[PDB]
């Protein structure tokens, strides 16, 4: 019930929630086609740096992200990884990289980004093309379910806490809707969330790239969105 709220945080400003021991949600807002949104990245502490995963979704919020990082936790972001594509995870990588904060993505990440004219994770991510594929990246590992939100849309998963990551891939328990779906593969969607229930059957903190973090019912919920979008 303490999870901030989108008319909670002005543009601009962000906050920091504690999920676990070493894991943090960040969250921030931003306007797109007129509308405020709340969007939702992690933090985890990786010795005495931590790690980063997305973007605060833009220049002025990932630069206001670093000031609440230093000053709330005051260990080093040496990198972060973008989990698809979208402004929302890389609006921000070149206040990132201007920073010193080592910046990734997958190769498909990297191509769609450039291809869209977003900014550019610098480093690629291999071993993850294939539906299924995980692989360790510090204290989380990174998954690709397969095409869900978007083709090239990754998870995180934090194993000393059982969190999982899920961003635009997996929507909060209050969606009513499906987002923004023009890069969605609507029918894949359901058998990739299905993929990350198989795989994290441990999950107990779920964190969706929008909205309030729950359970392991954010998964099924976002399949059913996503039918209710198709019919
Ligand atoms: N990940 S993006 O698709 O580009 C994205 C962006 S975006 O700004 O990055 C991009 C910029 C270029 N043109 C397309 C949008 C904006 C809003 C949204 C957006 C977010 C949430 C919602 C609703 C909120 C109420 N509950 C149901 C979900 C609606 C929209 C998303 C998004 N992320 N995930 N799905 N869509
Ligand atoms: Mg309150
Ligand atoms: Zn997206
Ligand atoms: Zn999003």
């Given at each position: ?17 504690q999920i676990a021991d070493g894991v ?134 934090v194993?000393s806490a059982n969190v ?41 903190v ?26």
């Amino acid at each position: 019930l303490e999870y901030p709220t989108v008319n909670e945080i002005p543009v601009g400003e962000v906050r920091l929630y504690q999920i676990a021991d070493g894991v943090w949600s960040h969250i921030a807002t931003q306007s797109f086609d007129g509308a405020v949104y709340p969007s939702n990245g992690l933090i985890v502490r990786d010795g005495d740096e931590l790690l980063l995963i997305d973007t605060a979704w833009g220049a002025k919020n990932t630069a206001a992200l670093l000031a609440e990082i230093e000053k709330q936790i005051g260990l080093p972001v040496t990198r972060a990884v973008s989990t698809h594509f979208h402004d929302d995870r890389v609006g921000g990588v070149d206040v990132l990289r201007a920073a010193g904060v080592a910046t990734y993505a997958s190769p498909s990440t990297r191509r769609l980004a450039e291809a869209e004219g977003n900014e550019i994770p610098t480093h690629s991510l291999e071993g993850l093309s294939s539906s299924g594929d995980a692989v360790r990246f510090g204290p989380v590992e990174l998954f690709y379910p397969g095409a869900a939100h978007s083709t090239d849309n990754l998870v995180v998963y934090v194993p000393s806490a059982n969190v999982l990551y899920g961003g635009c891939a997996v929507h909060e328990l209050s969606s009513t809707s499906a987002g923004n779906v023009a890069d969605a593969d609507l029918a894949e969607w359901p058998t990739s969330v299905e993929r990350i229930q198989k795989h994290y059957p441990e999950a107990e903190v779920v964190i969706p790239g929008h909205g309030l973090p729950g359970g392991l019912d954010l998964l099924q919920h976002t399949a059913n969105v996503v039918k209710a979008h198709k019919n």
